[PDB]
């Protein structure tokens, strides 16, 4: 019963497949590789990935690839499997495409029995906001959560989410109210809220029991690191990590 009754919709887009098709290899060399055979082989490779291989990445995961191919993937499904499917799709696409042609996905949460052309429009809006971020970005649950994928899976979905999950699994004082207040302090965030968070973590530091106390001490040392990191590249990441954890433990 842990997890929220959602359905997430990802619409990928290959970042400038028109420019990667028309110019593409012609950047390299003196026009030595500006041939037709390489372009046909590359487009058949895109066909073989986006038109066959998505049924391999979606095999165990529970979703529905509605449309795929060319430079678009519209895949509806359940949100843990959708996020893990985007994770595996890019983390084997950059193994497939050597890190070149970064894909710009957009994943929106939608409630139960909400219509789909209402939903495809918002997914496309998050998709184009992820497009215009830079060359590539993920847009997660709203256009203000816009990270690079190289920042999203490594920092949030590999480092931060596992620390956050293990920290709240192996303790039972700090339940969900503490996570909600951490999300709110991550979201408002003026200069004074860093002082309020430095008060909050330190006031909870001497309130946990003595046995599992230094877990909280290293976690507040590791949390005030990214909260006051003065970059805003390590802050909305942590807010999204806590949102993913809360949505994973929803009763």
């Amino acid at each position: 019963g842990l997890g929220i009754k959602r359905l997430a919709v990802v619409r990928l887009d290959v970042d400038d497949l028109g420019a990667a098709f028309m110019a593409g290899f012609s950047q390299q060399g003196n026009g030595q590789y500006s041939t037709l055979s390489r372009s046909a082989t590359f487009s058949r490779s895109m066909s073989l990935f986006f038109k066959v291989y998505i049924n391999q990445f979606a095999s165990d995961k529970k979703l529905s690839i509605i449309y795929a191919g060319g430079d678009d993937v519209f895949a509806i499904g359940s949100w843990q499997d959708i996020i893990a499917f985007t994770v595996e799709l890019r983390e084997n696409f950059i193994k497939w495409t050597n890190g070149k042609l970064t894909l710009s996905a957009g994943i929106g949460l939608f409630a139960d029995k909400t219509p789909i052309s209402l939903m495809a429009h918002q997914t496309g809006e998050l998709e184009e906001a992820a497009k215009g971020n830079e060359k590539d970005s993920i847009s997660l649950f709203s256009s203000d959560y816009t990270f690079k994928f190289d920042r999203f899976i490594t920092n949030v979905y590999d480092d931060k989410l596992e620390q956050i999950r293990y920290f709240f699994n192996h303790q039972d004082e700090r339940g969900k109210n503490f996570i909600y207040k951490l999300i709110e302090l991550l979201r408002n965030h003026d200069r004074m809220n860093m002082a309020r968070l430095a008060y909050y973590l330190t006031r909870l530091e001497e309130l946990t029991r003595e046995t599992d106390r230094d877990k909280f001490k290293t976690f507040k040392n590791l949390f005030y690191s990214w909260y006051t990191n003065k970059n805003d590249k390590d802050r909305k990441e942590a807010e999204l990590a806590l949102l993913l954890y809360i949505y994973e433990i929803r009763k």
Partner: protein, 121 residues
């Protein structure tokens, strides 16, 4: 002085600049000033800061100078709070209360003072 954006760092290195338990190194780098000699001051600023959002500025100006009474008084009892008001320019910022907004800003500065005072040990 205190503006809308600069006061938190002011309170930060007005907590840092305060001198600590140098003699008797039993958990050293700990303040001579006690936290109950700071919360008894901030319980004035909190009952201003939340009764400022209900009222005018020009209805509050009786308690506003009483803040300058009590800060002078509690600075006069212990040498630690006199040291505090020398490091943290409290009485020099109580002249800078001209409206509801700068009063709430000064109360946020007092909250930053107590927050960073609790932060270091």
């Amino acid at each position: 002085i205190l503006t809308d954006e600069n006061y938190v760092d002011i309170a930060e290195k007005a907590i840092l600049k305060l001198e600590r338990n140098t003699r008797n190194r039993k958990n050293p780098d700990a303040f001579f000033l006690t936290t109950s000699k700071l919360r008894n001051l901030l319980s004035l600023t909190s009952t201003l800061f939340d009764e400022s959002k209900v009222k005018e500025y020009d209805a509050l100006l009786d308690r506003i100078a009483y803040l300058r009474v009590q800060f002078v008084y509690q600075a006069g009892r212990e040498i630690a709070v006199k040291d505090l008001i020398e490091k943290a320019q409290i009485l020099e910022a109580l002249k800078e209360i001209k409206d509801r907004e700068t009063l709430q800003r000064f109360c946020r500065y007092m909250e930053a003072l107590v927050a960073y005072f609790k932060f270091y040990g």
